Amino acid sequence: GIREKIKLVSSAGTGHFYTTTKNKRTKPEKLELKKFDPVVRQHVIYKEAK
Amino acid sequence: PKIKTVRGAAKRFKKTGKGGFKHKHANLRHILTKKATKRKRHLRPKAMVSKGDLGLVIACLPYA
Amino acid sequence: GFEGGQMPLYRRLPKFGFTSRKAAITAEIRLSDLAKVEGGVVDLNTLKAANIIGIQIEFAKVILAGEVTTPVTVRGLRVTKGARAAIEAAGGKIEE
Amino acid sequence: GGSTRNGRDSEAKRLGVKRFGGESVLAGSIIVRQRGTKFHAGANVGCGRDHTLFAKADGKVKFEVKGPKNRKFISIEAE
RNA sequence: UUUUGUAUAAUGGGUCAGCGACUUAUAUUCUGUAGCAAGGUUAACCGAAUAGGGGAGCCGAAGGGAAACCGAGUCUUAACU
RNA sequence: AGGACCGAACCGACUAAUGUUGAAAAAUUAGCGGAUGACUUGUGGCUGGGGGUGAAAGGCCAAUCAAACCGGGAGAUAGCU
RNA sequence: GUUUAUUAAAAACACAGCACUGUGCAAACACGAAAGUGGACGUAUACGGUGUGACGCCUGCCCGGUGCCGGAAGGUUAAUUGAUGGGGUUAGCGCAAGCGAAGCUCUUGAUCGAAGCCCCGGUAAACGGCGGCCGUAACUAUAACGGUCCUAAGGUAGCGA
RNA sequence: CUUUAAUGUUUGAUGUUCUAACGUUGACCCGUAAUCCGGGUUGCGGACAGUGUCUGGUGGGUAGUUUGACUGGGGCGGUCUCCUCCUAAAGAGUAACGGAGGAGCACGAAGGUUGGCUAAUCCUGGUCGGACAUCAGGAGGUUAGUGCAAUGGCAUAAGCCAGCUUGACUGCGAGCGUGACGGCGCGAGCAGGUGCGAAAGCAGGUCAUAGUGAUCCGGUGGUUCUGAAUGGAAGGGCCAUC
Numbered sequence: 001g002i003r004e005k006i007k008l009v010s011s012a013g014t015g016h017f018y019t020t021t022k023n024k025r026t027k028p029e030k031l032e033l034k035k036f037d038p039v040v041r042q043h044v045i046y047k048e049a050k
Numbered sequence: 051p052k053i054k055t056v057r058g059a060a061k062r063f064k065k066t067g068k069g070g071f072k073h074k075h076a077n078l079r080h081i082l083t084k085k086a087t088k089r090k091r092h093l094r095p096k097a098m099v100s101k102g103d104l105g106l107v108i109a110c111l112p113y114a
Numbered sequence: 115g116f117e118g119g120q121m122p123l124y125r126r127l128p129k130f131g132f133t134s135r136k137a138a139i140t141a142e143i144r145l146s147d148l149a150k151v152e153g154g155v156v157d158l159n160t161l162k163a164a165n166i167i168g169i170q171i172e173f174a175k176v177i178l179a180g181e182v183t184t185p186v187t188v189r190g191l192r193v194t195k196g197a198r199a200a201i202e203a204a205g206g207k208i209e210e
Numbered sequence: 211g212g213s214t215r216n217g218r219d220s221e222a223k224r225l226g227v228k229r230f231g232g233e234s235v236l237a238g239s240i241i242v243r244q245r246g247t248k249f250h251a252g253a254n255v256g257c258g259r260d261h262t263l264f265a266k267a268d269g270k271v272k273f274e275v276k277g278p279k280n281r282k283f284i285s286i287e288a289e
Numbered sequence: 290u291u292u293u294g295u296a297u298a299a300u301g302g303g304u305c306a307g308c309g310a311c312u313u314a315u316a317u318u319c320u321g322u323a324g325c326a327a328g329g330u331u332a333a334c335c336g337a338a339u340a341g342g343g344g345a346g347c348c349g350a351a352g353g354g355a356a357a358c359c360g361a362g363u364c365u366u367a368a369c370u
Numbered sequence: 371a372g373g374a375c376c377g378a379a380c381c382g383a384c385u386a387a388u389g390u391u392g393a394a395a396a397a398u399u400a401g402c403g404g405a406u407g408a409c410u411u412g413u414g415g416c417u418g419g420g421g422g423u424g425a426a427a428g429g430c431c432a433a434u435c436a437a438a439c440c441g442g443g444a445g446a447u448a449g450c451u
Numbered sequence: 452g453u454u455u456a457u458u459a460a461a462a463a464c465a466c467a468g469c470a471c472u473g474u475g476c477a478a479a480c481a482c483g484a485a486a487g488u489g490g491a492c493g494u495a496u497a498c499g500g501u502g503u504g505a506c507g508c509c510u511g512c513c514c515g516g517u518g519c520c521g522g523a524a525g526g527u528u529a530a531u532u533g534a535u536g537g538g539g540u541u542a543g544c545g546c547a548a549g550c551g552a553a554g555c556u557c558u559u560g561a562u563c564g565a566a567g568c569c570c571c572g573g574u575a576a577a578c579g580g581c582g583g584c585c586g587u588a589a590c591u592a593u594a595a596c597g598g599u600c601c602u603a604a605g606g607u608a609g610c611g612a
Numbered sequence: 613c614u615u616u617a618a619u620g621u622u623u624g625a626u627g628u629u630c631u632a633a634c635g636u637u638g639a640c641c642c643g644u645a646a647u648c649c650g651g652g653u654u655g656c657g658g659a660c661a662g663u664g665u666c667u668g669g670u671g672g673g674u675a676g677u678u679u680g681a682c683u684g685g686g687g688c689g690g691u692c693u694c695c696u697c698c699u700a701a702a703g704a705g706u707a708a709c710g711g712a713g714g715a716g717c718a719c720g721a722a723g724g725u726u727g728g729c730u731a732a733u734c735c736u737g738g739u740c741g742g743a744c745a746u747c748a749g750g751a752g753g754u755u756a757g758u759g760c761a762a763u764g765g766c767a768u769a770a771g772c773c774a775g776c777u778u779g780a781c782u783g784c785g786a787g788c789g790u791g792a793c794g795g796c797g798c799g800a801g802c803a804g805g806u807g808c809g810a811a812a813g814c815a816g817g818u819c820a821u822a823g824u825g826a827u828c829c830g831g832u833g834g835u836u837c838u839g840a841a842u843g844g845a846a847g848g849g850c851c852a853u854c
Contacts, residue, residue: 001854005083015834019853020780021083026718033720034807036781038367041805043781053316056115059124061131062827067352074128074355076794076826082853088816089796091783094851095365102793103123110115110124112317126794126827132355132849135840146327146350169345172840178361179351194360213690213709220696220821221790221797223704234787235799242696243764243820260798261765261820262789267800278768355849356837366783370802373452384460396457403460408452425464427455477637477661530668539845557846567670 006031008046014039018046056110063099063107065114071099071107141167145200146180153184158191182206226263229287231270236286238263238271251283 004024010016014037022031031049036042063071075093085093099107108114115122143156143166150166158174176188178196185205193201198208226238236254240262249257251274254265263284272285 005854007853016782017852018781019083020720022720023718029720031720033780034778036779036805038782038804041782043778043806056124058129058827061129062124062127064355074130076126076128078128079853080826086816087781099123100793106117106122107124110122120794121827123794128827130355130849132838134356135838136357139840144350177351194362196361212713215691215695215713216699216710217695217697219706219790223790225704232788235789237788237798240789240797245765245770245820246768247765249768256799258798259820260789262798264789264798268787357850358837368783368803370784383456425453425466427459429455477635528669564668 004050006050008033008035008049010035010037010039011044011047012037012040012042022050024050053112055113059107059110060114063111063114065111066098071104071111071114072096073099136173139171140173140175141171143167143174143176144179145176145182145197148182148186151186153182153186155187155189156191157189176201226271226284229270232265232268234268236265236267236269236271238265238284247281248284249278249281250285252285254284254286 003021006018006020006022008018008020008031016037016039018033018035020031033046033049034043035046037044063073066072074096078093082090115124141161143151148166151164156164156174156176161171161174162169173192175192176194176197178194178200182200182204185207186201187206188201188208190210193208201208220242221240222242223240226236230236230238235256242261244261246257248263250265253267254269255267256265257263265286267286269286269289272287274283274285277283
């Protein structure tokens with residue numbers, strides 16, 4: 001699309017990801033969030049966000 | 051012509067070992083970010099039809 | 115197909131449409147039945163001669179329904195957990 | 211400066227009074243926007259985000275006819 | 290006859306004798322009623338005519354799963370819960 | 371020399387009355403317009419239904435027309451009488 | 452002259468006069484699946500069509516909008532051509548990822564593309580449009596005149612209960 | 613290899629020159645004292661005509677069709693989904709063009725947690741200072757502040773200061789709750805790994821209530837599912853998702 005949606009991926013080399021929607025018309029900024037990885041069984045920073 | 055199976059019902063229902071009919075959920079494949087994950091997990095097991103619609107589905111699928 | 119308005123449920127659900135396609139072409143044989151093979155021998159390469167469950171069959175399977183009393187002999191096919199144990203309880207043999 | 215609109219139904223129901231109860235949770239009255247104007251005084255702990263007079267415990271209600279200020283507590287009767 | 294409501298000034302209607310509307314078939318559920326029963330039952334065609342032959346045909350007897358596949362058990366699962 | 375002025379035959383059918391389930395399925399009485407001509411009439415032919423005819427009015431086309439008549443589709447259809 | 456047969460003979464239609472527009476000989480224009488016909492035994496001193504209405508004095512200003520016409524370059528774009536990239540298959544260099552070619556094959560469609568339209572101008576005897584405020588003459592009343600505001604431009608002639 | 617002077621063979625376009633295609637929209641002769649046709653004979657044009665096409669565009673002269681509703685008939689004005697109060701009859705239930713006002717979002721931070729702080733505003737005095745906005749003092753205030761209507765909560769702060777932080781978790785949920793159903797709310801307790809705190813305990817998103825739309829259609833990814841003679845692939849399913 002053109003509004004886009006976030007697909008934030010595990011930093012532990014896992015294929016695991018999370019999804020979220022975030023408005024860009026207020027400000028454009030990349031998300032740096034800490035989330036659970038069920039394959040290495042820890043909470044880590046997730047990458048490749050919008 | 052000899053009374054027909056509604057194929058728009060056949061591709062939407064399977065029959066259970068108790069006479070009732072089992073089906074999928076709507077609003078689940080085009081928007082996925084708008085339900086919280088508790089609601090997401092409770093919409094991974096499927097559903098069965100209630101009496102308010104069974105009394106019509108059992109006539110649209112007469113040979114089921 | 116009408117309830118005055120708001121659509122029937124059969125027009126407000128997702129389609130999936132996927133099936134076995136093998137079920138209609140599988141001969142499902144019971145221990146309570148089998149009188150078309152008379153407690154003799156069963157092999158899928160000669161089952162057309164007995165025509166049990168039909169003539170346009172591609173698969174054969176025996177299920178635990180009833181009790182068998184005579185030494186029926188199986189050559190290949192499919193037999194379930196309890197069906198094998200019921201055939202052996204009748205002196206019957208399963209050759210694989 | 212306008213006409214019509216008045217809201218749908220408010221979606222509330224009051225019944226957690228006298229000796230009302232429950233068998234796993236005492237769900238009480240469905241109430242709005244007040245997190246603890248009655249509030250719990252014993253093992254009847256709860257009253258969460260939905261503001262409903264709900265307790266994480268089973269039994270029937272009791273009223274003590276005193277409160278923290280002002281106001282009046284809600285509790286539960288003997289098992 | 291309409292209409293909630295008509296002795297109605299609302300609808301018509303002469304005379305008299307005739308004509309003139311809900312009929313029965315298949316499918317199926319409840320209701321009623323018999324026969325058979327873990328078994329009950331064939332179409333066309335033949336035919337000592339509905340019998341006797343004809344089991345292509347029709348119901349009941351297992352379930353879990355999208356399906357592979359499994360089965361008196363089974364899908365989902367790291368899973369005990 | 372008259373698409374001359376008036377006016378009979380000849381053509382029209384404007385005005386008033388009568389008749390209006392009539393004597394007449396628009397006829398009669400007395401006026402009025404045109405009357406060698408963008409006039410009229412006998413005979414046989416040609417133009418036909420979204421087609422003719424019309425110097426044009428929803429005027430005219432067989433006692434039928436905002437689409438005539440006749441055989442079939444046809445028992446069109448109807449949150450309707 | 453023509454006209455609504457039995458509600459209505461005209462102030463309507465039209466010629467004459469004038470503009471506008473199509474047409475050059477196998478005319479345009481027209482019919483008819485077509486053969487065959489009309490225009491025409493016509494040739495522009497001829498033919499098919501729109502408006503206004505003989506005659507006299509006349510024919511206002513506005514082309515910004517919609518329509519029409521003249522101009523020509525370039526843009527956009529369908530047909531068709533088949534570059535670029537990907538999918539099924541797959542050679543081949545890298546541990547592997549990373550990639551990734553020719554053929555068969557599924558898909559895309561770079562690019563070529565008259566005129567219109569966009570642009571510039573023309574056309575109001577095409578469709579149409581023909582605006583505010585302030586000051587100005589010693590009663591009162593109204594402006595022959597400036598200033599500023601709008602714009603495509605703001606009613607000349609003649610007539611007027 | 614390339615610039616530059618040329619060039620064969622075809623194929624479009626454009627101009628010119630022919631005549632064997634085609635016409636004759638010229639005539640005579642014959643069939644045949646037939647105004648047509650066809651042939652023949654002789655002239656004249658000419659690869660253009662004359663005839664018939666499909667692609668795509670233009671295409672309303674032609675055809676079929678579409679037409680929101682509410683409601684003292686109707687358009688105009690208001691309104692249709694979602695939210696708060698009064699209407700609402702001192703139970704549950706509840707309405708219109710009743711009386712009024714709002715929303716179709718915004719925040720990884722404005723979220724979670726431990727400690728600290730608690731207001732606002734008026735008034736008197738106060739410095740360039742501008743009644744007042746530096747500041748203190750007095751009164752006063754769960755009607756300040758919060759994001760936003762309204763209502764009501766909020767210090768056991770959800771308001772603002774400091775630090776630490778992501779439980780805005782993957783998988784499940786006893787049992788109860790709104791509704792006709794679709795859609796859906798609360799929740800004892802567990803699994804997998806954690807965050808704040810000295811600790812009990814707190815955390816499965818924001819102060820609670822508004823912040824676009826089903827089936828259907830296409831696309832992206834993982835697959836010891838299926839892919840109908842044996843297979844792959846395309847299509848379909850399961851599990852993810854725009």
